[PDB]
C-alpha positions as semicolon CSV with decimal commas, in nm:
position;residue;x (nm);y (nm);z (nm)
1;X;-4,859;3,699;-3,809
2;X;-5,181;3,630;-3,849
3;X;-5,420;3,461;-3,595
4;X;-5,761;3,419;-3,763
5;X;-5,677;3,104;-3,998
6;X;-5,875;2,780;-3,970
7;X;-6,042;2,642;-4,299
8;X;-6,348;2,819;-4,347
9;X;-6,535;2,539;-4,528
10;X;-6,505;2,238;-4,341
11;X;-6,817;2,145;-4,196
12;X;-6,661;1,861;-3,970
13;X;-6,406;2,114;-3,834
14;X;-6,631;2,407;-3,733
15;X;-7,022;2,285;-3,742
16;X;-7,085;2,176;-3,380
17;X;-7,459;1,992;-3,511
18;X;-7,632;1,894;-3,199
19;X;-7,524;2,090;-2,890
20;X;-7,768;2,345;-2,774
21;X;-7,712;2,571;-2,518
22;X;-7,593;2,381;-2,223
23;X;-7,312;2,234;-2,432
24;X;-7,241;2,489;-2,658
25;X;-7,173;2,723;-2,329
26;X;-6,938;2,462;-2,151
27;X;-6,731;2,409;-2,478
28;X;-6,641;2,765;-2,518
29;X;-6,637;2,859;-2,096
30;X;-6,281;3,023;-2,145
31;X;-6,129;2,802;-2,343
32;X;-5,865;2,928;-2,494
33;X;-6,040;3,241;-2,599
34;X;-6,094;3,298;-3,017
35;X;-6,279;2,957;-3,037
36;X;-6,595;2,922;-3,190
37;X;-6,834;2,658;-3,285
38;X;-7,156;2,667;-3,472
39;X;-7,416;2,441;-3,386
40;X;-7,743;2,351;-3,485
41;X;-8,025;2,643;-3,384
42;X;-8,152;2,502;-3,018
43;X;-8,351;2,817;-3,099
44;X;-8,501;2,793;-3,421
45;X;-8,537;2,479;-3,593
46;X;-8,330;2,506;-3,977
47;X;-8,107;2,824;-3,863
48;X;-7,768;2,803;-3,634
49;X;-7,589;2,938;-3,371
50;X;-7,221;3,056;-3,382
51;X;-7,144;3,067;-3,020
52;X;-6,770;3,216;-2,971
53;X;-6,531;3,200;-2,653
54;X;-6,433;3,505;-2,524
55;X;-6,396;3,667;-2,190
56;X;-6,527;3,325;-2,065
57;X;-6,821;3,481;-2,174
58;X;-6,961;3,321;-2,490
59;X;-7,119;3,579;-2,728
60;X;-7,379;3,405;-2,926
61;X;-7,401;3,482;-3,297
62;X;-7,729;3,325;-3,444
63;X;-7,721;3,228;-3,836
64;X;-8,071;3,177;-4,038
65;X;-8,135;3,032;-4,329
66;X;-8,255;3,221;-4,594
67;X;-8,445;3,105;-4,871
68;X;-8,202;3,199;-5,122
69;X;-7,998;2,980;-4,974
70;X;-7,793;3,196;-4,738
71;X;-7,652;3,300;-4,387
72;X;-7,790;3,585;-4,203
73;X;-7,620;3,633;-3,855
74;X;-7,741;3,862;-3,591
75;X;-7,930;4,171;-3,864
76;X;-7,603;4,138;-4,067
77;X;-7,641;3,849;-4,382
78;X;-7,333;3,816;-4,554
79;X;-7,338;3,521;-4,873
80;X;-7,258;3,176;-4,658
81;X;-7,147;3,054;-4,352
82;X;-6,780;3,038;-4,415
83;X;-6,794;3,386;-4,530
84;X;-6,927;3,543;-4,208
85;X;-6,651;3,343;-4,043
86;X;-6,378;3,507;-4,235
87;X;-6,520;3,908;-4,202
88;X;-6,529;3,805;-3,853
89;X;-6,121;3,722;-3,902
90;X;-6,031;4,104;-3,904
91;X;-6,406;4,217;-3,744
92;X;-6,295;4,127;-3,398
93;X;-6,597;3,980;-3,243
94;X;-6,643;4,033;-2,800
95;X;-6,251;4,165;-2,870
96;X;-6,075;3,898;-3,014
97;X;-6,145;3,747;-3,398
98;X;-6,229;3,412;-3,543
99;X;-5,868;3,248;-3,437
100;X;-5,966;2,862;-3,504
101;X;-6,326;2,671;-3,403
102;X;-6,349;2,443;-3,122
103;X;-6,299;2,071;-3,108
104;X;-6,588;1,885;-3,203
105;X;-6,435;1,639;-2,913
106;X;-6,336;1,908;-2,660
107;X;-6,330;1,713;-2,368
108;X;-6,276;1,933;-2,060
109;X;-6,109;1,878;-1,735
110;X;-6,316;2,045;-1,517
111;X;-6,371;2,427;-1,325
112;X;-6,516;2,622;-1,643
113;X;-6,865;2,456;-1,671
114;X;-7,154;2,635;-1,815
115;X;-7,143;2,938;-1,704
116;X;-7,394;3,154;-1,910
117;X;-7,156;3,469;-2,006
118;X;-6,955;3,542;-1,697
119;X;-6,709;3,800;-1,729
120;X;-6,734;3,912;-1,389
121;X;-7,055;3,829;-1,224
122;X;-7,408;3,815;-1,310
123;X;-7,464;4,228;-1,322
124;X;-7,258;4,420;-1,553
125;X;-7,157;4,395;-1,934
126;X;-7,490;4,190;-2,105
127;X;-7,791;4,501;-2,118
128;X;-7,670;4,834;-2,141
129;X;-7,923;5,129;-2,241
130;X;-7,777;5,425;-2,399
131;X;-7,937;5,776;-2,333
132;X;-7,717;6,007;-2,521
133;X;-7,809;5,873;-2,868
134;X;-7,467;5,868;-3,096
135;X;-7,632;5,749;-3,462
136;X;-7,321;5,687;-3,647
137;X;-7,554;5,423;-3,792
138;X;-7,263;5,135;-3,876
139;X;-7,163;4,840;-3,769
140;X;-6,823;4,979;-3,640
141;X;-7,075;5,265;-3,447
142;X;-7,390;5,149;-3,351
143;X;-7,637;5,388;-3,373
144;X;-7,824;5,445;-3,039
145;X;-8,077;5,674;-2,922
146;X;-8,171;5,874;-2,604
147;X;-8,303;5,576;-2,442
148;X;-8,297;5,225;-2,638
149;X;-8,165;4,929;-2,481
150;X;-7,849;4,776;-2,635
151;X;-7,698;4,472;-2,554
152;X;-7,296;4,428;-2,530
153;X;-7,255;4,174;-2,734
154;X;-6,913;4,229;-2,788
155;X;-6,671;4,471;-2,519
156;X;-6,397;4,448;-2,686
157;X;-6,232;4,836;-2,476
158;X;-6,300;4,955;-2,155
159;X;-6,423;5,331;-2,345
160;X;-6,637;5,150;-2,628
161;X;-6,871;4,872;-2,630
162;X;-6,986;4,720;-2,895
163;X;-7,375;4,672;-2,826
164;X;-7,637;4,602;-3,054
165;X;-7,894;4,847;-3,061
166;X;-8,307;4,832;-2,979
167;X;-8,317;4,737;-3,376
168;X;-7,996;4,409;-3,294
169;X;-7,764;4,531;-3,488
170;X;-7,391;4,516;-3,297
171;X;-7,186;4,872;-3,359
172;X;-6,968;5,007;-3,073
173;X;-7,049;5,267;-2,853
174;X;-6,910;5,501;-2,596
175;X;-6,962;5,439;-2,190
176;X;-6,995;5,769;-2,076
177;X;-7,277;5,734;-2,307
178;X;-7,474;5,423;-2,114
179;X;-7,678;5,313;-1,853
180;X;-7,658;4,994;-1,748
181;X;-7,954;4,823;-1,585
182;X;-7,861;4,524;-1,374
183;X;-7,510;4,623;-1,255
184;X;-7,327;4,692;-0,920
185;X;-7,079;4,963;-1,013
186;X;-6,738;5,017;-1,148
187;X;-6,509;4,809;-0,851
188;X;-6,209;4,760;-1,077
189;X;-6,191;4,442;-1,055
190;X;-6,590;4,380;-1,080
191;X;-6,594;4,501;-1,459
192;X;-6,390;4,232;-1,597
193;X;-6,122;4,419;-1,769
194;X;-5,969;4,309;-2,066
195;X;-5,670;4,522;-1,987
196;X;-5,613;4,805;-1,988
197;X;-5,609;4,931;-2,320
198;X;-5,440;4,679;-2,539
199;X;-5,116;4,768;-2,768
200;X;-4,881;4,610;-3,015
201;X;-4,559;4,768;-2,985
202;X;-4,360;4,702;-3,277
203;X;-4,223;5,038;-3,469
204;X;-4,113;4,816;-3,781
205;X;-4,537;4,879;-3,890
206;X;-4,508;5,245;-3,787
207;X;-4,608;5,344;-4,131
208;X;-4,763;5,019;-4,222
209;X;-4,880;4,920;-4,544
210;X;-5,302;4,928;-4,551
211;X;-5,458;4,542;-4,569
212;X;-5,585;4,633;-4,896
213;X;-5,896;4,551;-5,077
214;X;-5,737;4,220;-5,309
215;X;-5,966;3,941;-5,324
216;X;-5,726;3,671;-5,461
217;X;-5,853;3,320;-5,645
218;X;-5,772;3,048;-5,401
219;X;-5,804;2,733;-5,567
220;X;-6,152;2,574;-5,381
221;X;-6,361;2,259;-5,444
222;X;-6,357;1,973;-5,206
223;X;-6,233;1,831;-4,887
224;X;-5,904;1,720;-5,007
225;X;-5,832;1,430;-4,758
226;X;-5,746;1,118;-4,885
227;X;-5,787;0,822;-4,642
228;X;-5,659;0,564;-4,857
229;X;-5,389;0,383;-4,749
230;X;-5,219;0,519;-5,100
231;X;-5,209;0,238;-5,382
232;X;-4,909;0,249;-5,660
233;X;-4,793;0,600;-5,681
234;X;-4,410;0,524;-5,572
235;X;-4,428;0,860;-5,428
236;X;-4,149;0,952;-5,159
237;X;-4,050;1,182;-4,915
238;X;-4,238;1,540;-4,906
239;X;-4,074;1,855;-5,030
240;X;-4,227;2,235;-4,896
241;X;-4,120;2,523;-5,001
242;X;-4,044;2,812;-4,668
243;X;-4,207;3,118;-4,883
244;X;-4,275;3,320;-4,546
245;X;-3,999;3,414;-4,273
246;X;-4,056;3,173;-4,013
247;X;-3,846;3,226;-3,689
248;X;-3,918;3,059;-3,366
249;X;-4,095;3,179;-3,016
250;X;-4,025;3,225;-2,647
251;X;-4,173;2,943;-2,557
252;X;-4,051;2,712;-2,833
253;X;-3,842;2,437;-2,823
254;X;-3,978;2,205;-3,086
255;X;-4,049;2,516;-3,342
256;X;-3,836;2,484;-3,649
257;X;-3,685;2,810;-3,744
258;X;-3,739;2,871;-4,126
259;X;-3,703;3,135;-4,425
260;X;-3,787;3,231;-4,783
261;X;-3,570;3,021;-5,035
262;X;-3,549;2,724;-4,810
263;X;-3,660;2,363;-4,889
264;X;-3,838;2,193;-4,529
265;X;-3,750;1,829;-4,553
266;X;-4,064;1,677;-4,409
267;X;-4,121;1,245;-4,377
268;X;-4,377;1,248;-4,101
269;X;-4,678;1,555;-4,197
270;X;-4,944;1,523;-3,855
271;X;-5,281;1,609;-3,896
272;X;-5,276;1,856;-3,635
273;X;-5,092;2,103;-3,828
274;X;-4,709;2,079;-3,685
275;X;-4,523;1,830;-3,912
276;X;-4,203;1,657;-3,799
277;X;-3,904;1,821;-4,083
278;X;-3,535;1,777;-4,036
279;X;-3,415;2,070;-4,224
280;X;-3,067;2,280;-4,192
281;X;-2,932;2,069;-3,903
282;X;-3,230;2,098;-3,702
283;X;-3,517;1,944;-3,650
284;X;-3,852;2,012;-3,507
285;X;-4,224;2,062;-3,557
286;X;-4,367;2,331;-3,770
287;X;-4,699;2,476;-3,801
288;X;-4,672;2,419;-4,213
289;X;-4,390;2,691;-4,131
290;X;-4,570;2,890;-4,358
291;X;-4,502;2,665;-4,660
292;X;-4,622;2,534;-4,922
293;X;-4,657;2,162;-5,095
294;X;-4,530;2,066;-5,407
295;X;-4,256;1,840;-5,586
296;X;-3,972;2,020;-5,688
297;X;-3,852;1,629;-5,822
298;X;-4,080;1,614;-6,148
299;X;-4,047;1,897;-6,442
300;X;-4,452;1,894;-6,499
301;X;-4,444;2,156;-6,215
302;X;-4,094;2,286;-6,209
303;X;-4,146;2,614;-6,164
């Protein structure tokens, strides 16, 4: 299953505009944790600042504008915005990845306000220095020296941080290598703790086939959302196609259970994602199910 999804090119779904750091901070204090939101630079007037949600602690990602008329975030420049967004799907950022942005309304209760990066207190996990110099000299191992001063911008294990180095640039690194400055000292509890060490037990991947470098054409262009209140078209009831297994969850009871080969009758499609589909004498909300949209009625697209 995969958790990084969202769009990737919808500028009224992810771009956050005018926030600045005050309200970027309070929109991502927790959360829900793999939230982002980039907002216009409160920094630097023409770049912008991907601020993420993790840890209740969110890492702040700042994207320039170069004159070529591209994205540079944080030392590494990729070819847009949308396209750090997606590395960042499988990168794993503080230690979770690019799940979906934040609401551009995200209207908050209250309890998590502000609070600049707080993943335990105000001492440990923010400037580390580094004094046994490991230059791996990647972005997976940052490349520190015998006494630069690194900053965890992402701690994603409780053995490896990922800090970025005197030069900026984020790579993890070892803690029996570091030195952190303003800290109290390792109190269990005072260090935040992730967990720990995380684990997905299921021995169905234990010789798993590799992601694979495939970059496949998915059809682009624009926003494809039409408002209109849809003229003479004497269109009818939607028709998906399940082309993923789609079972349910522990905590479902409005999850529509689905599979490959099966056709999701669906009247009511929300905006939110789960559509309302009364399909094999059951029916129930489903998060496209995995599906995909066509019109198995006509012959233009039969196949």
């Amino acid at each position: 299953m995969s958790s990084a999804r969202f769009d990737s090119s919808d500028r009224s779904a992810w771009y956050m505009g005018p926030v600045s750091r005050q309200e970027a901070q309070t929109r991502l204090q927790g959360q829900r944790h793999g939230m982002f939101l980039v907002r216009d630079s409160s920094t630097c007037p023409g770049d912008y600042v991907l601020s993420v949600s993790e840890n209740s602690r969110v890492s702040h990602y700042i994207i320039n504008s170069l004159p070529n008329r591209r994205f540079k975030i944080g030392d590494q420049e990729f070819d847009h915005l949308p396209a750090l967004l997606e590395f960042y799907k499988i990168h794993y950022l503080d230690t979770t990845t690019l799940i979906e942005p934040a609401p551009r309304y995200p209207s908050p209760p209250m309890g998590s306000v502000s609070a600049p990066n707080l993943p335990t207190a105000e001492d440990n996990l923010e400037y580390v220095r580094t004094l046994y110099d490991f230059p791996g000299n990647d972005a997976e191992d940052l490349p520190f020296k015998k006494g630069e001063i690194l900053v965890i911008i992402e701690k994603p294990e409780e053995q490896w941080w990922s800090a970025r180095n005197k030069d900026g640039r984020v790579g993890m690194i070892p803690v029996p290598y570091v030195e952190k400055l303003v800290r109290s000292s390792p109190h269990g509890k005072h260090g935040n703790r992730n967990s720990n060490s995380y684990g997905i037990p299921e021995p169905a991947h234990a010789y798993a086939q590799p992601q694979t470098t495939t970059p496949l054409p998915a059809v682009s262009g624009s926003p494809g959302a039409a408002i209109t209140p849809l003229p003479s078209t004497q269109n009818g009831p939607v028709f998906a196609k399940a082309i993923q297994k789609r079972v349910p969850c522990a905590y479902d009871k409005t999850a529509l259970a689905l599979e490959v080969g099966d056709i999701v009758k669906v009247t009511r499609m929300n905006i939110n994602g789960q559509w309302e589909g009364e399909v094999n004498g059951r029916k129930g909300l489903f998060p496209f199910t995995h599906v995909k949209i066509f019109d198995p009625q006509n012959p233009d697209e039969n196949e």
